Design a protein around this ligand. Structure first.
Ligand SMILES: *[C@@H]1O[C@H](CO)[C@@H](O[C@@H]2O[C@H](CO)[C@@H](O)[C@H](O)[C@H]2NC(C)=O)[C@H](O)[C@H]1NC(C)=O
Ligand SMILES: [Cu+2]
Length: 223
């Protein structure tokens, strides 16, 4: 249980729920076929926000994950339970109006992922033990304009069968300036990109112990 509840841009936190569509509750989505897998949703309640955050293409933004909306610390238990091992992932989607677009449907492309490294340490553990900071590079080569940023953590501790995997995601509202437009990504849909049979979704992480992990979704877009 965790919530991406604020974004840091050019080293400044943009505010709780400011430009990030936050749910009231910190529980996961489990149904990968639900429209809620795009930017969270039912049976949670997601707030709207009128703020659209300007970012420079080619810089990093940092998603800040916290246990609850009202959490004030940054220790491990203030981010997410240590049982919740899995990847961190981030996607962008070009939209005409980031304050109103729903996120559901086609247009997503993956820009960041951190699965399990050669030492057996998961992406979520780096966020839990790194003060909740999930750093994401906005590619320099995309078209300028309005985008949704979908940041995600997947917890796989209870994922031996499907349903089981726990998807935690929120969408931030961006205005990307300075992109060169040199490269057009191939895109996927949410729902659609993840399936309940994917090897990174239906997985027993302890028994037998996994040595490699395949992050779900498409390959990372690079310039
Ligand atoms: C910007 O975000 C990217 C991810 O989108 C970060 O790149 C990773 O950095 C770690 C080191 O901390 C490496 O182990 C990974 O190989 C990097 N991934 C990629 C795709 O390069 C990058 O560190 C971030 N930059 C800043 C300044 O925070
Ligand atoms: Cu949880």
């Amino acid at each position: 249980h965790t919530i991406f509840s604020s974004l840091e841009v050019n080293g400044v936190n943009q505010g709780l729920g400011e430009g990030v569509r936050v749910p009231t509750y910190n529980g996961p989505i489990e149904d990968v076929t639900s429209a809620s897998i795009a930017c969270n949703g039912s049976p949670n309640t997601v707030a709207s926000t009128s703020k659209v955050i300007t970012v420079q293409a080619g810089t990093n933004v940092t998603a800040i994950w916290r246990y609850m909306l009202s959490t004030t610390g940054d220790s491990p238990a203030d981010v997410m339970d240590s049982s919740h091992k899995g990847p961190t992932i981030a996607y962008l989607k070009k939209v005409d109006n980031a304050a109103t677009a729903s996120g559901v449907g086609n247009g997503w492309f993956k820009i960041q992922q951190d699965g399990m490294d050669s030492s057996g340490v998961w992406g979520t553990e780096r966020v839990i033990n790194g003060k909740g900071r999930h750093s994401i590079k906005i590619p320099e080569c995309i078209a300028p304009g309005q985008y949704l940023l979908r940041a995600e953590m997947i917890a796989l501790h209870a994922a031996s069968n499907y349903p089981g995997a726990q998807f935690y995601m929120e969408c931030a509202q961006l205005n990307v300036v300075g992109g060169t437009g040199a490269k057009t990504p191939s895109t996927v849909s949410f729902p659609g990109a993840y399936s309940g049979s994917d090897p990174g979704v239906k997985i027993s992480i302890y028994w037998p112990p996994v040595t490699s992990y395949t992050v779900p979704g498409p390959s990372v877009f690079t310039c």
